Design a protein around this ligand. Structure first.
Ligand SMILES: CCCCCCCCCCCCCCCCCC(=O)OC[C@H](COP(=O)([O-])OCC(O)COP(=O)([O-])OC[C@@H](COC(=O)CCCCCCCCCCCCCCCCC)OC(=O)CCCCCCCCCCCCCCCCC)OC(=O)CCCCCCCCCCCCCCCCC
Ligand SMILES: CCCCCCCCCCCCCCCCCC(=O)OC[C@H](COP(=O)([O-])OCC(O)COP(=O)([O-])OC[C@@H](COC(=O)CCCCCCCCCCCCCCCCC)OC(=O)CCCCCCCCCCCCCCCCC)OC(=O)CCCCCCCCCCCCCCCCC
Ligand SMILES: CCCCCCCCCCCCCCCCCC(=O)OC[C@H](COP(=O)([O-])OCC(O)COP(=O)([O-])OC[C@@H](COC(=O)CCCCCCCCCCCCCCCCC)OC(=O)CCCCCCCCCCCCCCCCC)OC(=O)CCCCCCCCCCCCCCCCC
Ligand SMILES: CCCCCCCCCCCCO[C@@H]1O[C@H](CO)[C@@H](O[C@H]2O[C@H](CO)[C@@H](O)[C@H](O)[C@H]2O)[C@H](O)[C@H]1O
Ligand SMILES: CCCCCCCCCCCCO[C@@H]1O[C@H](CO)[C@@H](O[C@H]2O[C@H](CO)[C@@H](O)[C@H](O)[C@H]2O)[C@H](O)[C@H]1O
Ligand SMILES: CCCCCCCCCCCCO[C@@H]1O[C@H](CO)[C@@H](O[C@H]2O[C@H](CO)[C@@H](O)[C@H](O)[C@H]2O)[C@H](O)[C@H]1O
Lengths: 140, 108, 69, 8, 112, 226, 140, 51, 69
């Protein structure tokens, strides 16, 4: 996971773009400062070879042409960006079942591990405390 | 081959160093500066008594230049500061009486 | 109370002026956005209106700002 | 001196 | 001991600075002046009067409204000249060779 | 023929112009050593400050490309700050050499358009911090001009103080931050203007009789106020 | 995404904090004597406030009161179209241009008398040195 | 004599001196760090958040 | 269970791969930042560490984005 972070995999497209812009700006400023210095020296010396020599005063590799990140990978139960061919039912997994006179797991849906949702509906969300045996509130 | 310019720039650097050492509480450094402040210049030594008795336009030019360089008023009780000020003013007076100053932006 | 009954021509200092303008802004926001609550205005109420299918997601990590070294 | 340098 | 001065106390720091081995004249800090408008204003006034650029440049004079001169340069003249001679002869007073004149001046100026 | 023989006494006699030079050239004439001014305080870019801004602690955006590495103020300074002069204090809130967000315009019309839209002023972008001496010179000139304008004015020193605070807070390069500090003296000047006007033009009001409980306790003294 | 927000902080009452409300507080209601006082003043011909007169004598410039449906709610509005004056010449300033870099009086003045004086001092010293060089060259 | 006073509440049952709620703009938690996770225990009524 | 005991050479689809990487990222963040909690990772615990003088402020209004009309 740390290796991915070095390559910017966990970063967002905004962060990648900002890093790219930062490199661009640093390079631009270095270039313009070097040009000012070279022009001043070549003007006080009245020689073009000084300008020429200032062309090698600063080349490891190059900046990456494209970048790939984790947020670019699609996710979703209904999202068709993940559906190529239908998966057979005898290979799809089952959801847990709980039913009794005291409790069940069918009056609501908690969602997936990433895309979660409130199990209680809108009318009873303000009274969630009333549907619990224990309740540990937030810290604020 | 440029003694006047060299010693001018050196004296300016030494004034700056004295101020910095005073700010940072460094007697050793500030005394080093005071000692290195070019006291063995015959021209400035000979111009010193002339500046101490000058009057009028020449004095006003020299004082204008000295306020441009060092506008802060030194303490009237610190002889080291007083002497460095006198030395800088005498140097400027020598330069002026050799080649007067032209302080106005308008000129031709 | 300070101007008309104590004789102070300048009752509010800078802090009091800022407090007045803060309360004015909150009044504006409350009358502009229906149901606005704590994070934006100092106000809390329980009976709120929710969509019906409330999704819960993790917030994005704080933006990496460039820094020296 | 000015009256605003006074604090006590 | 020397605690940080917040940004709100800088105006007072400018006209009442802390003590240093080389302090300025705090009583005279409000009197330090150097006008950047001297020559522009002089030229404007003369050209409005009706003079030419050459006449204005010949009539121009340096500003007299500058930081006042140290009265020591007129009161301690002889002692200062003697100290400067001692310095010129003894390499800037290294290893306390002008302490005599410097202490005489310090006493004259301070008086305990 | 060597260049600059008599011009480097700092080098001949090991005289350091500052603790940084002392530490670098190993002269070792500063008894207290040197605590380096880090790069984030030596240079950087303008940043947003208010907590009621969403882009707080983020660099200010300009029409031109800019390095987004910000100047960081000194938030946890050491107890001993031996040099408490303005020179060493200003580095905790501004960079002496100015910010690193200055543009090099490829053309003159870009400069024109930026200025026209309020996104560029050379006074603000191509400049350094003001030294204490310069600040004092400006303040004293302004004070002389104000006194010449009107000596028998009560808000004179208040105007002088707002000018002084702007200059000290470096309004040339941080106008918003400096106004945040000087608006209080502006407000005091406003109040003094009204007060002077009402004293000149006799403006008074009928005061009501004294309240039955002006004193909270009979034994308490009722200090009289004009 | 600001309207119709959720309860972000908890609502509670600390133990034994007072309420200062009796059991008939809901039947209680407010009252101001201002309406009755105005009726009585109008009926008895008591002194009226000057806000009843639209013209404003509280300044030298003409002001007229604008009323919002009642004499008690008014704002003064100025009538004059004020003429403004500028003791300034036109075309004497180009703020976008950096003037400290151009050579000339305007350039030196956008710079300062201190820089100009320093430049003049350098000029004088350089002239001294060059005069020495001229002497030693022409004496040969 | 022109600065205003803060409210005073003191009794065997409750007080307003064990904490500070702050101003209208700059507010702060009245309970200290150790008991903030147990704020529920210092209330006669508690209406939780909606989440 | 899918690869070694059922014979599937490609057990994870795109969704399962994303879930795996999400959990990996959460592990990294949890071990990197001490005490990180719900908004950034799916995790809640009561015994938290607070500064001692906890200030409460209103959040800034949402940034006005430029729009047509
Ligand atoms: C695709 C299509 C799909 C379609 C759908 C398909 C569906 C799938 C396929 C289905 C295929 C069909 C299969 C069949 C259906 C499956 C059903 C099934 O499996 O169940 C699952 C489902 C549970 O599954 P689950 O996933 O675990 O659900 C969550 C849990 O249940 C949650 O648990 P909880 O948190 O809610 O706690 C519940 C708690 C509940 O606990 C209690 O209710 C006990 C309360 C007792 C209070 C009083 C006790 C006094 C005794 C004192 C003893 C002396 C002192 C000792 C002190 C310590 C003891 C107190 O614990 C218990 O349940 C204990 C149960 C074990 C004890 C059972 C006792 C039986 C005694 C019977 C007595 C008979 C007397 C007859 C006399 C006739 C009259 C003359 O069943 C339930 O609904 C659970 C509740 C069952 C009700 C039991 C109630 C017993 C109460 C007896 C009281 C006796 C008092 C008599 C008084 C009258 C005389 C005066
Ligand atoms: C250990 C220490 C010993 C040393 C002592 C040291 C101390 C010495 C100094 C003295 C202490 C000073 C300390 C400073 C005090 C500052 C704090 C403070 O006072 O307020 C705090 C505290 C703060 O409250 P808050 O939230 O800030 O609200 C403030 C409001 O202003 C007030 O809130 P509120 O207005 O909401 O509360 C009033 C409440 C109570 O107000 C009243 O009730 C008025 C009082 C009337 C009393 C007489 C009626 C008695 C009837 C009895 C008959 C019952 C049936 C008989 C059954 C017999 C078998 C049991 O009203 C109600 O709850 C609802 C009742 C509405 C009806 C009332 C009018 C009808 C009355 C007739 C009944 C008719 C029913 C018809 C129904 C409709 C049919 C169609 O104030 C109160 O709680 C007020 C009520 C306190 C009651 C305490 C309950 C215990 C009372 C016994 C005390 C000890 C008795 C000793 C023996 C003598 C009796 C035998
Ligand atoms: C810069 C320097 C500054 C320095 C600082 C300077 C400070 C300022 C200047 C100071 C200057 C000095 C001034 C003097 C100090 C000021 C002190 C002051 O003003 O106080 C303020 C301060 C309160 O001010 P605060 O701002 O309002 O504070 C917040 C509220 O207090 C919060 O209220 P809460 O929410 O906590 O609710 C409290 C609740 C508390 O309510 C209760 O505690 C009542 C509980 C009763 C339960 C049992 C009742 C049974 C009766 C049944 C009746 C028949 C059935 C009827 C059914 C309905 C009634 C139940 O309500 C009451 O307090 C009711 C009070 C009114 C009734 C008083 C009853 C007195 C009876 C005395 C009996 C004497 C018997 C002697 C027998 C001797 C043995 C032979 O005082 C307090 O601390 C409040 C508590 C006072 C304690 C009262 C406890 C009375 C309990 C009597 C029980 C009797 C049972 C006997 C059994 C034994 C025989 C078997
Ligand atoms: C085997 C069948 C016989 C045994 C019955 C077992 C118990 C039955 C469960 C309770 C039935 C009512 O359930 C109630 O309606 C649906 C249940 O999905 C939920 O409603 C929620 O999910 C539905 C999805 O269909 C959404 O449209 C709705 O917006 C949302 O609020 C409510 O949160 C629940 O309170
Ligand atoms: C159906 C029957 C109706 C019966 C009507 C009876 C009417 C009685 C009206 C008396 C009103 C008196 O009202 C009260 O009197 C006193 C003096 O008298 C006034 O005066 C008092 O307060 C003011 C200042 O606070 C000062 O004048 C002075 O400090 C004090 O004497 C009060 O300002 C006024 O509030
Ligand atoms: C008139 C005096 C006699 C009557 C006494 C009245 C009750 C006394 C109040 C409780 C005393 C203990 O109070 C306890 O310490 C201080 C009180 O400011 C608070 O502590 C809090 O404020 C202090 C400020 O000084 C901070 O340094 C501390 O970090 C913070 O946690 C605690 O939240 C409180 O629990």
């Amino acid at each position: 996971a740390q290796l991915h972070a070095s390559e910017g995999f966990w970063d967002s497209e905004s962060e990648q773009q900002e890093a790219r812009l930062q490199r661009h700006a640093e390079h631009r400023n270095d270039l313009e400062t070097t040009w000012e210095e070279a022009l001043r020296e070549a003007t006080l010396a009245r020689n073009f070879d000084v300008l020429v020599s200032y062309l090698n005063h600063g080349q490891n590799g190059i900046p990456p042409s494209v970048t790939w990140n984790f947020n670019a990978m699609p996710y979703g139960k209904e999202n068709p960006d993940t559906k190529t061919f239908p998966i057979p039912d005898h290979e799809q997994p089952y959801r847990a079942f709980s039913l009794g006179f005291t409790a069940n797991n069918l009056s609501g849906n908690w969602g997936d591990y990433i895309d979660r949702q409130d199990n209680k509906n809108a009318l009873m969300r303000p009274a969630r405390m009333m549907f619990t045996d224990v309740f540990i509130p937030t810290t604020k | 081959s440029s003694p006047h310019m060299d010693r001018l720039l050196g004296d300016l650097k030494l004034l700056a160093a004295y101020d910095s050492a005073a700010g940072w509480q460094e007697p050793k450094a500030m005394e080093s500066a005071f000692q290195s402040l070019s006291w063995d210049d015959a021209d400035v030594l000979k111009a010193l008594p002339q500046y101490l008795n000058c009057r009028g336009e020449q004095k006003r030019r020299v004082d204008f230049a000295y306020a441009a360089l060092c506008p802060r008023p030194v303490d009237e009780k610190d002889p080291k500061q007083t002497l460095m000020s006198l030395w800088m003013k005498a140097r400027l007076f020598s330069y002026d009486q050799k080649h007067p100053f032209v302080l106005s932006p308008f000129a031709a | 109370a300070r101007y008309c009954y104590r004789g102070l021509d300048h009752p509010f200092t800078l802090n009091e002026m800022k407090d007045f303008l803060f309360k004015l802004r909150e009044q504006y926001l409350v009358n502009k956005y229906e149901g606005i609550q704590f994070p934006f205005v100092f106000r809390q109420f329980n009976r709120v209106s929710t969509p019906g299918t409330l999704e819960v997601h993790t917030s994005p990590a704080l933006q990496q700002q460039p820094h020296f070294h | 001196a000015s009256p605003m340098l006074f604090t006590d | 001991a020397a605690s940080t001065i917040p940004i709100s106390q800088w105006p007072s720091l400018l006209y009442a600075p802390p003590s240093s081995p080389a302090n300025p004249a705090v009583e005279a800090l409000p009197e330090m002046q150097f006008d950047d408008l001297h020559y522009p204003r002089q030229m404007l006034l003369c050209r409005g009067a009706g003079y030419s650029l050459e006449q204005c440049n010949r009539m121009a004079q340096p500003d007299a409204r500058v930081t006042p001169e140290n009265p020591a340069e007129k009161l301690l003249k002889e002692e200062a000249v003697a100290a400067i001679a001692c310095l010129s002869q003894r390499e800037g007073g290294k290893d306390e060779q002008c302490r005599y004149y410097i202490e005489r001046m310090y006493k004259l100026a301070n008086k305990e | 023929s060597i260049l600059g023989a008599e011009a480097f006494p700092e080098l001949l006699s090991k005289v350091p112009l500052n603790p940084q030079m002392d530490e670098d050239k190993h002269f070792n004439k500063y008894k207290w050593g040197n605590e380096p001014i880090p790069v984030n305080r030596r240079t950087g870019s303008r940043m947003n400050s208010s907590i009621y801004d969403n882009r707080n602690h983020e660099a200010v955006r300009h029409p031109w490309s800019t390095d987004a590495r910000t100047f960081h103020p000194n938030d946890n300074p050491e107890a001993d700050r031996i040099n408490t002069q303005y020179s060493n204090m200003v580095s905790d809130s501004f960079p002496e050499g100015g910010f690193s967000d200055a543009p090099r315009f490829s053309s003159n019309w870009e400069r024109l358009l930026a200025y026209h839209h309020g996104l560029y002023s050379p006074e603000k972008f191509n400049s350094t911090t003001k030294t204490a001496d310069e600040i004092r010179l400006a303040v004293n000139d302004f004070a002389a001009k104000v006194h010449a304008d009107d000596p028998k004015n009560a808000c004179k020193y208040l105007m002088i103080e707002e000018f002084k605070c702007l200059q000290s807070a470096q309004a040339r390069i941080d106008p918003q931050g400096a106004a945040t500090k000087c608006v209080k003296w502006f407000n005091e000047w406003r109040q003094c203007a009204w007060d002077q006007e009402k004293m000149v033009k006799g403006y008074n009001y009928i005061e009501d009789r004294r309240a039955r409980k002006h004193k909270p306790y009979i034994g308490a003294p009722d200090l009289q106020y004009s | 995404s600001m309207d119709h927000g959720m309860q972000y902080s908890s609502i509670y009452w600390e133990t034994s904090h007072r309420t200062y409300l009796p059991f008939w507080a809901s039947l209680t209601q407010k009252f101001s004597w201002k309406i009755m006082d105005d009726q009585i003043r109008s009926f008895l011909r008591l002194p009226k406030p000057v806000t009843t007169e639209p013209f404003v004598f509280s300044s030298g410039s003409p002001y007229i009161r604008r009323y919002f449906g009642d004499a008690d709610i008014s704002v003064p509005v100025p009538l004059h179209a004020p003429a403004h004056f500028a003791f300034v010449p036109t075309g004497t300033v180009s703020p976008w241009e950096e003037t400290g870099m151009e050579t000339g009086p305007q350039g030196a003045a956008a710079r300062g008398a201190a820089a100009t004086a320093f430049r003049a001092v350098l000029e004088s010293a350089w002239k001294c040195d060059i005069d020495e060089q001229i002497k030693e060259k022409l004496h040969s």
